[PDB]
Motif scaffolding. Structure first.
Motif, PDB file in Angstrom:
ATOM      1  N   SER A  31       0.809  -1.204   0.000  1.00 20.57           N
ATOM      2  CA  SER A  31       0.000   0.000   0.000  1.00 20.57           C
ATOM      3  C   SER A  31       0.856   1.274   0.000  1.00 20.57           C
ATOM      4  O   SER A  31       1.604   1.501   0.949  1.00 20.57           O
ATOM      5  CB  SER A  31      -0.920   0.005   1.227  1.00 20.57           C
TER       6      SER A  31
ATOM      7  N   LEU B   3      -6.551  -7.663   4.397  1.00 18.85           N
ATOM      8  CA  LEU B   3      -7.685  -6.787   4.218  1.00 18.85           C
ATOM      9  C   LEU B   3      -8.909  -7.567   3.757  1.00 18.85           C
ATOM     10  O   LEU B   3      -9.997  -7.020   3.679  1.00 18.85           O
ATOM     11  CB  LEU B   3      -7.332  -5.656   3.241  1.00 18.85           C
TER      12      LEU B   3
ATOM     13  N   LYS C 104     -10.054  -8.517   8.016  1.00 20.19           N
ATOM     14  CA  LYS C 104      -9.634  -7.413   8.840  1.00 20.19           C
ATOM     15  C   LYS C 104      -9.747  -7.783  10.301  1.00 20.19           C
ATOM     16  O   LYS C 104     -10.755  -8.372  10.743  1.00 20.19           O
ATOM     17  CB  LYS C 104     -10.468  -6.167   8.518  1.00 20.19           C
TER      18      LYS C 104
ATOM     19  N   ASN D  44     -10.290   2.030  13.282  1.00 21.33           N
ATOM     20  CA  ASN D  44     -10.750   2.818  12.125  1.00 21.33           C
ATOM     21  C   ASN D  44     -12.144   2.362  11.683  1.00 21.33           C
ATOM     22  O   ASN D  44     -12.315   1.807  10.632  1.00 21.33           O
ATOM     23  CB  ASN D  44      -9.776   2.705  10.960  1.00 21.33           C
TER      24      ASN D  44
ATOM     25  N   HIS E 166     -13.647   4.250   8.128  1.00 21.23           N
ATOM     26  CA  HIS E 166     -13.122   3.820   6.814  1.00 21.23           C
ATOM     27  C   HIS E 166     -12.695   2.331   6.709  1.00 21.23           C
ATOM     28  O   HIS E 166     -12.702   1.759   5.606  1.00 21.23           O
ATOM     29  CB  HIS E 166     -11.922   4.706   6.437  1.00 21.23           C
ATOM     30  N   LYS E 167     -12.327   1.726   7.839  1.00 20.42           N
ATOM     31  CA  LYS E 167     -11.847   0.333   7.884  1.00 20.42           C
ATOM     32  C   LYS E 167     -10.689   0.115   6.892  1.00 20.42           C
ATOM     33  O   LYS E 167     -10.590  -0.924   6.207  1.00 20.42           O
ATOM     34  CB  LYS E 167     -13.006  -0.617   7.596  1.00 20.42           C
ATOM     35  N   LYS E 168      -9.802   1.099   6.850  1.00 24.00           N
ATOM     36  CA  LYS E 168      -8.640   1.103   5.946  1.00 24.00           C
ATOM     37  C   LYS E 168      -7.321   1.166   6.723  1.00 24.00           C
ATOM     38  O   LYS E 168      -7.269   1.715   7.831  1.00 24.00           O
ATOM     39  CB  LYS E 168      -8.687   2.314   5.001  1.00 24.00           C
TER      40      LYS E 168
ATOM     41  N   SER F 269      -6.015   7.696  11.773  1.00 25.14           N
ATOM     42  CA  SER F 269      -6.256   7.173  10.423  1.00 25.14           C
ATOM     43  C   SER F 269      -6.101   8.310   9.435  1.00 25.14           C
ATOM     44  O   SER F 269      -6.124   9.482   9.827  1.00 25.14           O
ATOM     45  CB  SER F 269      -7.638   6.550  10.306  1.00 25.14           C
ATOM     46  N   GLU F 270      -5.884   7.925   8.181  1.00 21.67           N
ATOM     47  CA  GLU F 270      -5.594   8.783   7.027  1.00 21.67           C
ATOM     48  C   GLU F 270      -4.113   9.125   6.998  1.00 21.67           C
ATOM     49  O   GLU F 270      -3.604   9.855   7.851  1.00 21.67           O
ATOM     50  CB  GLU F 270      -6.445  10.029   6.968  1.00 21.67           C
ATOM     51  N   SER F 271      -3.434   8.535   6.013  1.00 21.59           N
ATOM     52  CA  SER F 271      -1.966   8.546   5.969  1.00 21.59           C
ATOM     53  C   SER F 271      -1.313   9.936   6.175  1.00 21.59           C
ATOM     54  O   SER F 271      -0.385  10.065   6.968  1.00 21.59           O
ATOM     55  CB  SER F 271      -1.470   7.916   4.663  1.00 21.59           C
TER      56      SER F 271
END
Ligand SMILES: N[C@@H](CCC(=O)N[C@@H](CSO)C(=O)NCC(=O)O)C(=O)O
Ligand SMILES: N[C@@H](CCC(=O)N[C@@H](CSO)C(=O)NCC(=O)O)C(=O)O
Lengths: 215, 215
Positions: free
Chosen positions: A12, A36, A39, A47, A50-52, A64-66
């Protein structure tokens, strides 16, 4: 102790961003690989919206969010290796070009290997155009951050690891069209923080062959 | 010293208007015709050619939330728009980001589509509003006792709710009463009240546009 955990998935580009930031800052952390397709409870708890991945977890509290995690890293571990400018106007411009990466490079790049024909042609053209615009911003500097890597370098260089994907499924020769961009990426890869964080292009390509065939 | 390029019904410009009023910054407002973009707009935001553009001593800052952060950082000793705590700051950025992903585009689909697409947009739109109500909790504002970054990011979209209600055939007042009560609390602050056009004005603007469309 001060606990840092990173929930991630090796190919990723978004996770690679946070890997570089942690390495450049010299921050000890635990890396946790997610499936993924299955999960973990941790991921779903940390998270929910978004589950990301990536998710940065600092003493049990998630970010969360890079790019938000990278900014959090800059603000908390602020006494070495600055990743953003201290001048407000230059900081605004770094944020602008990092934003530009999300919307052009990532989105258009995904169309190069998931679309076809006239639409995929468009993305190839626009993608090269974006790379060229980014080359213009870099100019004759060593990094987008100047003498050291900064926010835009961290936002952007992970996508180099996907270039064989874009080149192969897109029938593109990016180095032929954008030599300044490729030389810049190779400069970044000589830094330990980047080298250790980024998989080889061929490893990413072979991974994408397997997931693309199911599309 | 400070100029704002804007277009009066744009929620994105409204964000920057609120930030400037909160800080008490004197500035020149310039209205753009987006069908006949000024040479200054094309000069100052060549990359996206969008409003708002904040211009500080001749230097442009584009992207509304980047501009709000610039304003916070430069005029930093009055009326904080973001938390000082890095974790709380990351959460504010996270929820502002969530607003940027969701509200504008789903809202647009509500008044420009038909059939199942329109009803799906409505459903996702209300789901997003409810998730935001949950984050607000029992707080006066998203920012707590005063308005902050997430309030600024989000409340401008309330000026479009008669558009969504009328063309979407839905009653946001009934489905999301906590959200609407929060927006009305915001509109009692002078900085917000002077920055936000009446819902009726935005509604009539869209009425004249939409009646020309073949949907
Ligand atoms: N805006 C976010 C995007 C993260 C993302 O796409 N993550 C993917 C990685 S795998 O392609 C993800 O976790 N997706 C979840 C899934 O595929 O179910 C950020 O900047 O961190
Ligand atoms: N991500 C940006 C979006 C600005 C925007 O959409 N601006 C519109 C306003 S009018 O719908 C715009 O300027 N569009 C230009 C056009 O329609 O040509 C931000 O946050 O500032």
């Amino acid at each position: 102790t001060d606990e840092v955990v990173l929930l991630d998935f090796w190919p990723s580009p978004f996770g690679m961003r946070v890997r570089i930031a942690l390495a450049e800052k010299g921050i000890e952390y635990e890396y946790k690989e997610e499936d993924l397709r299955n999960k973990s409870p941790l991921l779903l708890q940390m998270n929910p919206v978004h589950k990301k991945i990536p998710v940065l977890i600092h003493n049990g509290k998630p970010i969360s969010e890079s790019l938000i995690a990278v900014q959090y890293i800059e603000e908390v571990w602020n006494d070495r290796n600055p990743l953003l400018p201290s001048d407000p106007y230059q900081r605004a411009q770094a944020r602008f070009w990092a934003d530009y990466v999300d919307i052009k490079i990532h989105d258009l790049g995904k169309k190069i290997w998931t679309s076809k024909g006239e639409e995929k042609e468009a993305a190839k053209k626009e993608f090269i155009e974006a790379l060229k615009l980014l080359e213009e911003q870099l100019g004759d500097k060593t990094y987008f951050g100047g003498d050291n890597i900064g926010f835009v370098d961290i936002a952007l260089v992970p996508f180099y690891t996907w270039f064989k994907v874009y080149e192969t499924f897109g029938s593109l020769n990016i180095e032929n069209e954008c030599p300044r961009f490729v030389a810049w990426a190779k400069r970044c890869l000589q830094k330990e923080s980047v080298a250790k964080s980024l998989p080889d292009q061929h490893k990413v390509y072979e991974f994408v062959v397997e997931i693309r065939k199911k599309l």
